[model samples]
Target: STGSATTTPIDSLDDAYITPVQIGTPAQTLNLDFDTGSSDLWVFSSETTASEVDGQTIYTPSKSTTAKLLSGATWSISYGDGSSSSGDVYTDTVSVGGLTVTGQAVESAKKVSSSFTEDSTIDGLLGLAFSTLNTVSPTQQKTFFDNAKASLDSPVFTADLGYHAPGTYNFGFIDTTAYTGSITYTAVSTKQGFWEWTSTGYAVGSGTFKSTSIDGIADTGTTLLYLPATVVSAYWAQVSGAKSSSSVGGYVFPCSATLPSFTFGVGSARIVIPGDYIDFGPISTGSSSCFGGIQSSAGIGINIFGDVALKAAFVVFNGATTPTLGFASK
Candidate 1:
């Protein structure tokens, strides 16, 4: 069966996309960040540390008759951002949109870092990455997509990310109407436990497209685009008053600067991110400086085609025997 769900950007910055999921018998709905960057379907729970819990919703395992403790299993996951959570495991009926799984592994948080507790907008996270990356022990569990792939119309899921607007995440089927132009697919390399692939280079606005091999991951959980220093600095050069300050971090430029559009290739397809999308709004409430959406990924070790780039096109993460990624104009 095919299923679809609404994705809402948690804030004006479009930091992360949140979706509602039902867990257990009677269905406890929580707004979870659907993260493709990591594999661990964890949640803030009745077991979370008191001071670590704030204005966020918690999953009450005791309230669900179908919930059962995975006796010897436990999990701990940390994100690139440094925030982390650790918990005991439970198996319960889990549903996203309309797709349902009989016994999906659900990690109920016993402890969470301050960074996660302070984010009142996000209650937890749902893993969409490969199961190989799951942090659970004793016996690793498959991701929701993996467990449900057999019943899907196609073993695939699509992410339609919007710029400062509501988007969608669909499983088992691709709604052709959600995208335009033909889809260009590339093989995925899962060795690193991510939807990683090489890009066919990029261009600055209407400039020439360089046919260079750029390896990166398509991360829906990350907020911005990150390439090598060469590419990032090159893009910033086009903006007047743009400067990089170690103190402020990355490149900051005048809010009035005209940002050239960014275009990157996926096979022969070129998806363009409008100039405004590169302007990550003002640096502060009344500041005239704005942070660049495209930054150097040198420190991170690999390029990241995050929400900025994903929102510029429709992306399909195929969970086929030989996983692939498909990008199309929207």
Candidate 2:
């Protein structure tokens, strides 16, 4: 059967989009961030110290009849931004939208970093990346999608991310009404546990499209668009008053500066990111300086087509042979 769910942005941060998910037999509804960059379904739970739990809801496995401990199994994960979580494992009924997976691995966090503990709204993370990336020790765990895909009509899902608005994530089938124009498809290389691909090139505003191939990953969990240092420098050079700041840790420009649109190539398709989207709000409260959403992926190896870039188009994460990605204007 097919399923779909609405995804909403978290406050004005535009840092993440979260969706509802149900866990356990009786169903404990929680708001989770569907992340494609990492593979591990983890949640704030009773295992966490009371002092560590903030205003977020916690999952208590003892309350669910379907919850079974995978004896001796444990998991730990750390994000690029230093956010981390870890705990024991349990097999329970986990459902997203209308899709359900029986005996799915659910990691219950006993410890969390300040980043996750401070976020009171996000209860957990629903990983959509390749199962190979799972962090469970001794024995790797399969994600909810991986466990449920076998029963689906088609192993596919679509991410319709919106800017400062609600979007939809559709599973098992694609909703043609969610996008406009023809969907442009590109082959993805999953060797790195990511939906990675090479872009033909890019252009800044009305400039000519560069033919250089840029390898990057379409990561839903990441909040900014990160490209090569050279490419980032070139783009900011066009914006007046923009400069690299060690204090800001990235390129920052005057909030009032008029920015040019950025374009990314996917096969013959050119997905454009509006100029306003590049201005990622103010760098700090009451500050006239704004952080550029497009930053340098200098040491990260792969460029990241994060929320800032994904929200500009409708994306389809195809699970079929050769795994592909389809993009269309929303």
Candidate 3:
């Protein structure tokens, strides 16, 4: 079967799009954030200390007759601090758009970070990456896509995200009507379970294409575009008055400064991000300096071709044994 769904922006920055999903028999709806950067589907639910589940739609497993608590199964993930989110497992019918996956493993949260509890637009998370990476103990879990892909018309899901607007995620079928030209595909390496690939470098504004392996991952889960410090430096070089600020913690420039469009290569094709996409609002309230949507990946040790870069193209995340990523200008 094929499936499609609309994702709308809930965060003020327009960086995160919390998607709608249905679970259990009565079809309790929750606004969930999908992350390909990680595995395991988890949520804040009735089981959480009622006070800690603030500002989020809680998943009430007790109300869902079909929800089965998987005995003794547990999972925990780390944060920059030693604090972490740990949870137990439940399997229930889960649906995204119209695609249904029976026995979908859902992690019911026992604890979550203070930051996660406060930024409450997402009830929890769903990972579309390889299922083997699931952290559940004594057993792993299948991703929503992994369990559903076998029943899908094809083994791929796609993202067509927009800036400050609603976007679409399609599973199993490609929507040819959504794009302008033919797709340019690349052989992707699923090592470490990330949808990682290499682009044929980038161009500044209308500058000539620089030839290099722009190693990166297609992470809709993240907010900004992060490349090598060198690449980030080159892009910011064109903006007058752009400075790396200590308090702002990123390259920022005057709100009035002109920004150039950025282009990255895909096969022989190129996708261009509008100049405005780089102006990531202001550094703070009443501030004249604004942060950039592009930053250095050097500190993180990987390039993240996140929302800023993704919104400009039609991205294909193929689930074939030898997966590939295809991009097309929208």
Candidate 4:
């Protein structure tokens, strides 16, 4: 897993760029954003100008011999962050590694912001998440997993290798042996596409942590873990000799001493957040001054348990069967 070659860039959008990967033939290549937050495949077109877009990579289909555009089909997606993309649909023979999915529906954005227009390297995003978010109806759209599932020797798994924060994709069989023991499963809360969970409050360090009653959502698409301001502050108060620095954001601390480990009790299972994760990333100001994983959301009404929290455990989001989500690890 360590020696896997890093993806190479061919273009830039805004500040970010797309990496090159071989398609159907070794000679044929395409750029992709391997995103896990959303489920949709799309590219930018020549019709789209720089004024309407922002600082992100855009795809130009004209560069690829295999690219094809769809007629009569149109799409516009608006994210919770207020950013939007609108364009027509297209189909093409797409590939990564040894897997191939033909006639895949890809959205070609015609309108965007400066954030998206500035990234000149990438042509489009390649979402590798659950298919529930797929804009194309099942009758017409088939995700790469939808087509490749049957042929694989085992269930296909992906590791969004974003350790460098650039993002990477892994397909085919997951090295399950790398994981240990049985997976811990969490029953779905029969709602919409969101992963809903009940919160019994939170704890900090090895001290007395509170279990305040609340309802919350755990989402893999989210990058930051948001918590109630009161709850977060209460947890922070428990950290022995915790200090605050504006340069380190709000809850950054400088001590090397291990803080208390936290346990998230879900149903009958207790999900633990190791202290190592809290101190994993470097501080904005000082290297030894580690950043606190949990932060205050202030006015944000909803609490999002992001990747930082999810990475501690293996999550199997199963929407194919009754909108279920399974959390497990080996």
TM-score to native of every candidate shown:
0.98, 0.98, 0.97, 0.67
All predictions: root-mean-square deviation over Cα? 1.0, 1.0, 1.5, 6.0
Candidate 1 yields a Cα-based lDDT of 0.91
Clashes of each: 0, 0, 0, 38
**Per-residue CA lDDT of candidate 2, range 193-268, in tens?**
9888888899999999998899898899999999999899989999999999998899999999999999999888
Task: Kindly indicate the candidate among 2 and 4 with the higher lDDT.
Answer: 2
Assess each prediction's global lDDT (C-alpha) against the native.
Answer: 0.91, 0.90, 0.86, 0.54
Give the per-residue lDDT digits (tens) of candidate 4, residues 1-330. 111113442322112224454443223455665544556776665556667555444445666566676667776665544566777776766666645666667677787655456555555666555556666532345555555555555444443323223433344444455345555555555343355666555566555546665565665444456677776776667676566556656686655657556555554454566665455344643566666767766655667666556555555444344434434432
After superposition, candidate 1 runs with Cα above 4 Å error: none
Tell me the tens digit of each residue's lDDT in model 3 across 100-215: 99999889888888867887788888888787778899888889999998899999999998888889999999999988889999988887678989999899998999988888
- In what order do the candidates fall by lDDT, top score first? 1, 2, 3, 4
Instruction: State in Å the error of residue 10, model 1.
Output: 0.7
Q: Candidate 3: worst 10 consecutive residues by lDDT?
A: 77-86
* Model 3 alpha-carbon miss at residue 84, Å: 4.6
